[PDB]
Structures are given as structure tokens and as C-alpha cells.
Amino acid sequence: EFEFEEITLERGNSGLGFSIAGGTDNPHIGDDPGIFITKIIPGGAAAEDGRLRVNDCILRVNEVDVSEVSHSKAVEALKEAGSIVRLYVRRRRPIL
Amino acid sequence: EFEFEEITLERGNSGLGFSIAGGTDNPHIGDDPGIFITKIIPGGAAAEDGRLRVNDCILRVNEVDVSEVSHSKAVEALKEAGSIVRLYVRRRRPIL
Amino acid sequence: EFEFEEITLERGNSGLGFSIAGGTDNPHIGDDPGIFITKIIPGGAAAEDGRLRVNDCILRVNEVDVSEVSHSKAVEALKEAGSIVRLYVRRRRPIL
Ligand SMILES: [Cl-]
Ligand SMILES: [Cl-]
Ligand SMILES: [Cl-]
């Protein structure tokens, strides 16, 4: 049902360049408290790397488990991750 | 408020090539248990045909009514539909 | 966390050309009753203007506060706005 991927980004000055929604305090989809990518910004690290996709659920940020955290905590994890940011993500597998 | 469309796809080896979310067991939007297209994969049948759109709600798969089913049942309907897959879909009409 | 923007569209004959979802009667995201842009139609005023983005939350339509209204009321506000339609919108700021 899902595919998983490790994606490490080099933040640089352009920034990670994606928007997120979700968290235990405000689920973005049903009761799923996941941190979801809602938008990817042209020129940002995510866009240049090419692997991250809209709707991807971020499960881990470097060593921080963000599978079940508040939106605030997800933001803090992303902010403190530094210049080298390892994302472990989950996405829906397409119907074939 | 809505537009409806019949779209029949020829699966071939590329596959239908779209992701879905939703169902009675896990509504993708509010209490709407609809089966929604969340992504369309380049090279797939859906993309090549061109008619199916992200956010389209699949109401019927061949002769199977998927208006109110579990996600599992929607998947099973799509899997068993064979090579010729008739989708009856609903989408929001745009504000003009 | 958010960015705000004023966007005024000239409706013309092409129409505003965007789809919306949400409202107090049927929240599109969690308990957020916001009116959200779900799609932007090529050739429409929104697309030609270029500023409006999918996921943008419409807070105001000319002088009508649509921050907390039914979907029906949001539609009525957009319909009665005439040819010159001032939208005040909110969107998520991206992670940098
Ligand atoms: Cl967004
Ligand atoms: Cl998806
Ligand atoms: Cl839509």
C-alpha cells in the first residue's frame, strides 16, 4: 500500500523549500497525525533534488521521530536539523 | 456543484497508473467516504488517456458500486476489473 | 506560519476559473471551515493573473467575510461579487 524512501537534502541558502501540514494537534487527513508535504517550492533544495513529492509523509527528520508529534514539534525538528537533512518518507503506492 | 464523466481505460502493461485514498473505513475528506484520485502517474493508462484528474471521485468501477465501500474493497474492485476498466467519476465544477 | 495576499481579479467572460471546497457545514481540512482553492483552471482569470495558488484559503470576497461561512454562502459571495473580485487569501509559508 505504501512505498518508503530515504531522501537527504543539503539546505544551503535556498532553504528546504517545502510546505507541511498535519500533526497530532491538527490532523491534515482524518485522524492521521502525519506530517505531510503540501507544496514543493521551485529553486528550493527539495525541488532541485527532485525526489520529494507532494503528499509524502515525513516520518523521520535526521534522528527525530516525527511519526506522532504536534505540528510545532515537526517544525522545530526541521529547523534544528541543520544543513544536512535526512528525511525518511512514506507515500501511497499507485494502482497498477 | 459537480460534473460527472465516464472514462474507460485500457490497462495494458503500464497499469492504470493512479493513486487513491479514502473509503468508509478511513474518509479522505471529512465524512466523505469517497474513493479519491490523489495522484496520476506519467506513462500510466490514466495519464495517456488524459481525462482522469486529481481529486476525481471514483463512484463506479465497471459494474461495482464503490460510492460507499472500504478502501480495501475499492482496491479489490480496481484489481479485478481486468484490462478494460470503466470508471464513472465525479469532480467539483469550478467557480466561473 | 502563514502568508497573506490581496488578489483582485477581472472576471470577464472566461470566469474566475477556480474550484473551491470547505465551509462550516463541511470542513475540507479537519475542523478548519475555511474556503480552500482546490483547482485552478487554465484560461480562467485566476490562471491568467497567476497569483492565486491551489490550497489558498479565501478569507474575504470584496466586503464579504468568508472566514466562517457555509459552502453555499461562499459560493453566493463569489457569485454576487461582480466583474471585479477582490480576494484576501491565506497560505502556508514554506519551510526554509
Ligand atoms: Cl500548501
Ligand atoms: Cl498521493
Ligand atoms: Cl478540485
Residues shown for chain C: 96
Task: Evaluate whether C84 touches C8 at the Cβ level (below 8 Å).
Answer: yes
d(CA C23, CA C57): 11
What is the phi-psi region of residue A85: left when phi exceeds 0, alpha when psi lies from -120 to 50, beta otherwise?
beta
d(CA A59, CA A53): 14
From the CA of C86, how many Å to the nearest CA of chain B?
A: 15
Furthest C-alpha separation in chain C: 39
Q: Where are the alpha helices (DSSP H) in A1-96?
A: 45-49, 71-80
End-to-end CA distance of chain A: 12
d(CA B38, CA A55): 8
Pick the CATH number of A1-96 from 3.40.50.720, 3.40.1350.10, 3.40.50.2000, 2.30.42.10: 2.30.42.10
Cell readout for A21 is: 501540514
Question: Which residues fall within 8 angstroms of residue C43, CB to CB, at 6 or more apart?
Answer: C14, C17
AA identity, residue B76 = E
Please give the backbone phi and psi of residue C68, each rounded to the nearest 5 degrees, phi first. -145, 70
Q: Cα separations (Å) of B2 from B44, B58, B92, C17?
A: 26, 13, 5, 15
d(CA B82, CA A63): 44
d(CA B46, CA B33): 22
Strand partners, C61: C64, C87
d(CA B88, CA C18): 23
Q: How was this structure determined?
A: X-ray
A19, A20, A32, A72: best mutation site toward chain C, by most C Cβ within 10 Å? A19
d(CA B53, CA B70): 22
C2: enclosing H helix or E strand? strand C2-10
Task: Evaluate whether B83 touches B38 at the Cβ level (below 8 Å).
Answer: no
Helix (H, G, I), strand (E, B) or coil at A83: coil
Cα A38 to ligand 1 centroid, rounded to whole Å: 4
B40, B52, B57, B95: best mutation site toward chain C, by most C Cβ within 10 Å? B95
Q: Which of B29, B92, B96 sits opposite C15 (nearest CB)?
A: B96
Q: Print the SS3 string covering B45-82.
A: HHHHHCCCCCCCEEEEECCEECCCCCHHHHHHHHHHCC
Q: What subunits make at least 3 CB pairs under 8 angstroms with B? A: A, C
Parallel/antiparallel/unpaired status of strands A84-92 and A64-65: unpaired
The one-character DSSP state at C53 is -
- Report how far Cα A46 is from the mean position of its chain's Cα atoms: 10
Question: Which residues fall within 8 angstroms of residue C37, CB to CB, at 6 or more apart?
Answer: C18, C19, C20, C46, C52, C53, C54, C55, C56, C57, C58, C89
- Cβ within 8 Å, pair C21-B92: yes
Give me the residue label for grid cell 470542513. Answer: C27
Parallel/antiparallel/unpaired status of strands B18-22 and C2-10: unpaired
Cα A2 to ligand 2 centroid, rounded to whole Å: 10
Where in chain B are the domains?
A: 1-96
d(CA B82, CA B71): 18
Cell readout for B49 is: 488517456
Task: Evaluate whether B33 touches B22 at the Cβ level (below 8 Å).
Answer: yes
